Design a protein around this ligand. Structure first.
Ligand code: XAN
Ligand code: XAN
Lengths: 153, 153
């Protein structure tokens, strides 16, 4: 029994008037996102000098194609994750030398392009090791259920 | 196409040397956790005066049973989510009048017990509305895949 199943068990015993079934799927969803970010993905980003969220900025710029420059709005719309503090992240990346602000565009530098080209290869190998417990069918199955849940919001 | 599928499409076109398939399931996992916390669960907690993470503390204490008092270590082990800043959350909850520090235990006050008894009922109704796009079988299916992924870590 994991955190979520144990908690549901305690709730059934303590508040029998309650149907706490929904707590398992949502508790596991949030714990999986947290543990994977904290223990797997972010330590790899930090090996590359990237704080959480900064990889996404560079990745979005890189995969938009040459000249790897987007408006801050397009950067938010094309991000993998709709996380905030985008102005702070661009500022940090600029002082680090990986993006520059042109005209108003945010663009990879040569150094930033080189970094993300390196980091994305390490990132996808890391992701496959994160998902290796699930078979290919289970991974597609999990992607489909997550897409339905997301659209339901 | 969602954020994740669109990003994978751009990657296949820009770095054909890369297999970016893993990005869909993990991108959807993190976006679903984020959107559900930000747009669904946390606004409900804030209706009750609870910041993100504080509900979990009260919920853990309440479901441990009378006298609703745990060591800070037990509080971390029994939490639904292994999130940090537990000392800060206990401090906040203490100044708010919902927990007290006894002997070293953290315990619900009368006011804190009443609050969590009210909030947990609202919380589970909110969770069912969050999950309503998925059928009962899909929800169990999603809980099983998430459990396998978590154990794989
Ligand atoms: O293109 C991307 N792929 C990812 O896996 C990712 N994670 C955060 N930001 C990201 N961008
Ligand atoms: O018992 C609990 N049930 C939940 O759904 C939850 N979410 C955060 N913390 C929680 N504790």
């Amino acid at each position: 029994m994991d955190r979520a199943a144990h908690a549901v068990e305690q709730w059934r015993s303590e508040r029998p008037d309650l149907d706490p079934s929904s707590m398992i799927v949502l508790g596991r969803l949030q714990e999986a996102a947290l543990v994977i970010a904290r223990d797997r993905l972010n330590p790899l980003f930090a090996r590359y000098g990237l704080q959480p969220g900064e990889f996404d900025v560079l990745a979005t710029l890189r995969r938009s194609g040459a000249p790897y420059a987007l408006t801050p709005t397009a950067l938010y719309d094309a991000a993998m994750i709709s996380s905030g503090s985008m102005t702070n992240r661009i500022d940090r990346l600029e002082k680090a030398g990986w993006v520059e602000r042109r005209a108003t565009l945010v663009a990879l530098t040569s150094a930033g392009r080189a970094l993300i080209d390196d980091a994305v290869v390490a990132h996808v190998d890391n992701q496959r090791r994160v998902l290796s417990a699930l078979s290919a069918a289970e991974q597609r199955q999990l992607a489909k259920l997550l897409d339905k849940l997301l659209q339901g919001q």
